[PDB]
User: What shape does this take?
Amino acid sequence: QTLPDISTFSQQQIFENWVQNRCIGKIADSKSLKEDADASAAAWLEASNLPAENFEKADEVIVSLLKQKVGGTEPGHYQILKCTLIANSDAIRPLKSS
Amino acid sequence: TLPDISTFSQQQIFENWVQNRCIGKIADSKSLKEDADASAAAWLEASNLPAENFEKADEVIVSLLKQKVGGTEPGHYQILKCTLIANSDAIRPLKSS
Amino acid sequence: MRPAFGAAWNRFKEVNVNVEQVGKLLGGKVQHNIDAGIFKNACPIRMSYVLNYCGIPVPSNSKYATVTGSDKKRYMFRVKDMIAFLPTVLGKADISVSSPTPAQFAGKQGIIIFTGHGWLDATGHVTLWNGNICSDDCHFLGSPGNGSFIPTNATFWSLK
Amino acid sequence: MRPAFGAAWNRFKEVNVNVEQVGKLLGGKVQHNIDAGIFKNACPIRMSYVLNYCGIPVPSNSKYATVTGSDKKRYMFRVKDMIAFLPTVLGKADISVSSPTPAQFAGKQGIIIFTGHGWLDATGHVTLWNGNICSDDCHFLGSPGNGSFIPTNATFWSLK
Assistant: This one.
């Protein structure tokens, strides 16, 4: 069946998804997956109405928050989950406003 | 400080399970697939939905991943696709018990 | 109204294997969801097996999400459900202590729940304790298997 | 007063290179965001360069998101903004047609916009047309570089 258009997401979700996709790109141990995640992030970027500066600052927040270590019963580092936690964090939140 | 999973809505928790599972199916990296499926199992635990919702959603995921999605960049925009799938009409009814 | 310790220990041994092998044993919907990679955490599933075969059948109840094994019995797949379920069928815990250490459970045998923060996918771990070791892994303060888990409480019921 | 076609065409040539090389040429925050992997679509950036250096400065306006190059001039990074901007400085489009082919643009030279569906990251492509080819790649119906893009309109302004 058909996928939703990017325009059907809220502006907030568009920014969150940018942050999440960009985080995935930073943690991916994969050149192809990194290129995919960054191309994906650039689609959310186009859809957003926020100024560039919001994204520039968010990228700094991302690099800082990615350093946090999380875990679970599995032996990995749960980075994929962390990407979502970061997108929805208080530190990213004010960058959702112009 | 990162937010606790409990601060998300039940809908968002299910959407994130779907997105994570989708990532786990498209990732080339063994380490990233494991992380994605581990991450999904965490959303699974936080959800209150019956197992059946997840079983059916995984079949919807396999079907929708076949969609070809494109942009100005040469790739297949899989990571974008994972989010679109999580938020698709085909997944929506599995958000209710 | 509690399972015998010897029988519980014996049942747990049969499922004291990785999640794929737990699925091979149980079959049915349990195996299907494990093989798909959807069920990763075998902990509530192992204890469901123990209870099912020691006279405390996992019920059909809206409170606790379950799937069936090939035995047509029910298995919980969320550890938070198994944690909530146990006091409803075992009664009030015999011991509930914060910052749990093994000495607090010397000379005791039964079912133990370690709860705490730090595991994104699990509020705790449910297992058996024989007075010296757990049936799989313990998660006391200082237990080597904790990883990011920080134990804040252990809750326990003696079995004879 | 629209820019001259020859100047426009020559300026475009200078930025008819991949996005990393566009960043190298423009420097400043444009290069920084390109090097960071944040800006991927060079299309509105190229046309910003052309307009800036052919007598139409890209403004500091809230309507159009911009960053500066080393020249301290402004460059748009969203193609939707460049599409919206063009009529505000060039006036009403000379030609606007559905199902675009070169037929409608024979004997014409100037700035062309192809809009359509199928690119998740872009509502269209903005470039120059010389009467035979585009300054990078055209996106008429059946154009070989379309990929998943399907044009539903082309909008055009004559230069010279």
Notes: The interface with chain A takes residues 29, 32-33, 36-41, 65-67, 77-80, 120-122 of chain D (CB under 8 Å). Residues 79-90 of chain D form the longest helix (12 residues).
